[PDB]
Amino acid sequence: PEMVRQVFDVGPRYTNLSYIGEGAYGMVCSAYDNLNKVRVAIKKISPFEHQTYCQRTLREIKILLRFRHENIIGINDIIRAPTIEQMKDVYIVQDLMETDLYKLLKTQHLSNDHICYFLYQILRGLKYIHSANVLHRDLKPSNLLLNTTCDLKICDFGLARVADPDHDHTGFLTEYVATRWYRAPEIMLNSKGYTKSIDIWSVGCILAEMLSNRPIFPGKHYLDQLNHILGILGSPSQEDLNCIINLKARNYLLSLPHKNKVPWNRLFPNADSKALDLLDKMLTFNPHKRIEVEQALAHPYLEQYYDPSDEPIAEAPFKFPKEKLKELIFEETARFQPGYR
C-alpha cells in the first residue's frame, strides 16, 4: 500500500496522495481519481476498537448515503477490505474543496458580499438537514468547506442526531454537545442538544466570526463558555428565566450580578446593519425565541439570494456492541464494492 506520514491504502484507483488535514479517526489526503479524472479528498477512519468511534462513523455514513444537497459534501466512494475479517480501516472519498472557513478566517478578511453568500449557503444546507429531522450538532468554521469560487459545503455528520424536542430537558452543567465556542447557552443549563435551535446558535457564532475574524465567545474551558455568552448578551430577562424550570440552573443565573447587553454595532462597527439584526435573532438566549432556519433564509440580509423554490428539503426524513457496529458499517458500505451487485 501507499503510505503517508502510516498506511493510506486507497489504490489503485486513487494515486498521487498529498496530506491535507485531519478527521476524527484519521488523516485527510487529497488524491487523483484515475476513473473520474479529478482530484478528490479522502478521509481515513480507524474506528473499530471503540464503540463510540464506530457509532460516529456509522451515523455519518447512514446520513450521507441518504442526503443529497449542493451545500452538503456527500460521499463519492467508500474503500474498505472485502471481508469483515480483513476490514481494519475505512476510507471515505469526497469532493476536493480548496479550503475550510477556519483556515480562511485565519488570514482573509471577508467582504460583506462574501459573508452574505457564505451565510446563505450555510442556512440553505441547514434547511435541508433540519427538514430531514436531523441536527448537525457540530457546526463550526472548520466544518465549512469552500471551493475556489466560494461555493460552500457542510462537512462531518458524525455528531448528528435525530431531533427529539420532547426529550431535550436535563440538568445543570452536565451536557457537552458541540465544540465549546459554538455551544448554545442552554447546553450548560438544561438542554441535551436535541432541538434544531442548537444549530442556529452555532450559525450565529459563525456569522459573528465572519464579521471580525475572531470567535465571539472564546471560552477558555467548559465552564468559562457561559461567562462569555452572558458577558455580551447581558442578564436574561425574567421571562426567559421563568422558562428554565430546573432550580440549579435558574438559581445559578439568579445569583449573578446584573450584566448589560453589549450592542452588536459596538462589537461590529463596520458590519451591515441587516447582518447584525439577523445575528441578534440567531444569538437569542431563549432557544424558543431563537430564529428558525426558514425564517433566517427570509431575513432582509439574505434578500439577494432568497428563493424558497431553490432551497430544497429532504425527500425521506429520518424518523428515529462494536462487533455488531463493525458488521453494520461493513453492511452499510457494501454498495461501493466493485463487484457489490
Interface with ligand WMI includes 21 (CB under 6 A)?
A: yes
- Interface size with ligand WMI, residues (CB under 6 A): 18
**74 touches ligand WMI (CB under 6 A):** no
Residue of 10, 29, 31, 41 interacting with ligand WMI (CB under 6 A): 41
What sign for the dihedral angle of Cα 131, 136, 140, 144? negative
Residues 6+ apart with CB under 8 A from 109: 213
CA distances from 32 to 40, 93, 218 (A): 6, 11, 38
User: Please, what is the minimum distance in Å from the beta carbon of residue 62 to ligand WMI?
Assistant: 17
The nearest distance, CB 139 to ligand WMI, in angstroms, is 11
Applying CB under 6 A, the span of 21-29, 159-167, 256-264, 309-317 interacting with ligand WMI comes to 21-29
Among the listed residues 27, 28, 81, 298, the single contact to ligand WMI using CB under 6 A = 28
CA dist 67 and 156 (Å) reads 13
Q: Which stretch binds ligand WMI (CB under 6 A): 18-26, 176-184, 212-220, 295-303?
A: 18-26
User: Between 36 and 260, whose beta carbon lies closer to ligand WMI?
Assistant: 36
Give the residues across from 32 on adjacent strands.
15, 39
CB of 273 to ligand WMI, least distance (A): 32
Instruction: Give which of 100, 111, 175, 192 is closest to 141, Cα–Cα.
Output: 100
Q: Which residue is nearest to ligand WMI (CB)?
A: 155
Of 312, 27, 304, 288, the C-alpha closest to 169 is 288
Per-residue DSSP letter, 169: B
Q: What angle do CA 27, 106, 219 make, to 5 degrees?
A: 85
**Residue 96 engages ligand WMI in binding (rule: CB under 6 A):** yes
User: Any residues with CB less than 8 A from the CB of 321 and at least 6 apart, and which?
Assistant: 51
In the block, cell 432550580 appears at: 247
d(CA 235, CA 232): 9
The response to whether 274 counts as a known ligand-binding position is no
Q: What residues form DSSP beta bridges with 135?
A: 161
71 interacts with ligand WMI by CB under 6 A: no
CA atoms within 13 A on the CB side of 313: 12
**Coil vs helix vs strand at 128:** helix
Compute the distance between CA of residue 50 and CA of residue 158 in angstroms, rounded to an integer. 14
Indicate whether 20 belongs to the interface with ligand WMI (CB under 6 A).
yes
> Which of 177, 144, 185, 145 lies closest to 160, judged by CA?
177
Question: Does the footprint of ligand WMI cover residue 156 (CB under 6 A)?
Answer: yes
To the nearest whole angstrom, how small is the minimum distance from the Cβ of residue 51 to ligand WMI? 20
CA-to-CA dists, residue 212 to 110, 268, 320, angstroms: 9, 7, 39
Give the shortest CB-228-to-ligand WMI separation in angstroms. 23
Determine if 99 is a binding residue for ligand WMI (CB under 6 A): yes
Residue 94 in contact with ligand WMI, rule: CB under 6 A: yes
Catalytically annotated residue among 33, 138, 156, 199: 138
Judge whether 138 counts as a catalytic residue: yes
Residue 72 CB, nearest approach to ligand WMI (Å) = 11
| Binding-residue pattern over the window 271 to 310 for ligand WMI, x denoting contact by CB under 6 A | ----------------------------------------
Question: Any contact of residue 46 with ligand WMI (CB under 6 A)?
Answer: no
Residue numbers in the known binding site are: 20-28, 43
Q: Name the site residues for ligand WMI (rule: CB under 6 A).
A: 20-23, 28, 41, 43, 73, 94, 96-97, 99-100, 142-143, 145, 155-156
Cite the active site residues.
138
